[PDB]
Amino acid sequence: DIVMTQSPDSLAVSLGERATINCKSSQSVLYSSNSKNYLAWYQDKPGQPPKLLIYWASTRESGVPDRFSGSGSGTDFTLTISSLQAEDVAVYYCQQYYSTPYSFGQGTKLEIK
Numbered sequence: 001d002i003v004m005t006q007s008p009d010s011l012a013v014s015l016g017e018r019a020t021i022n023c024k025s026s027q028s029v030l031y032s033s034n035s036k037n038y039l040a041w042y043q044d045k046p047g048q049p050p051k052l053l054i055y056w057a058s059t060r061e062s063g064v065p066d067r068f069s070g071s072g073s074g075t076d077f078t079l080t081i082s083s084l085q086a087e088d089v090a091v092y093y094c095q096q097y098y099s100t101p102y103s104f105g106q107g108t109k110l111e112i113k
């Protein structure tokens with residue numbers, strides 16, 4: 001199974017500062033025919049359903065501000081929030097949908113320092 005591993009498990013960043021979250025896939029999720037990374041990022045707020053933030057590893061979902069940026073190819077991916085705002089507090093998850101069963105990381109709890 002393709003296993004997704006996030007780092008760190010928890011991060012306390014100060015408002016206005018940058019938060020960086022890593023996600024590693026056990027095998028490449030970069031499809032050579034497409035040249036696309038089947039990697040997604042979700043933002044999950046307490047008690048709320050998860051919201052899709054970025055897909056194809058770097059494409060932002062409609063409405064998502066550009067301070068959220070996803071990058072990486074193959075096996076190493078990153079979610080960088082430039083200038084963390086109070087509403088950014090949530091657990092962030094990466095997911096691969098390269099091949100079934102689709103899998104997620106254990107999440108990274110992002111908090112205001």
Ligand code: IUM
Binds near residue numbers: 045046049
């Ligand atoms: O808080 U919720 O998937």
Ligand SMILES: [Zn+2]
Binds near residue numbers: 066
């Ligand atoms: Zn901009």
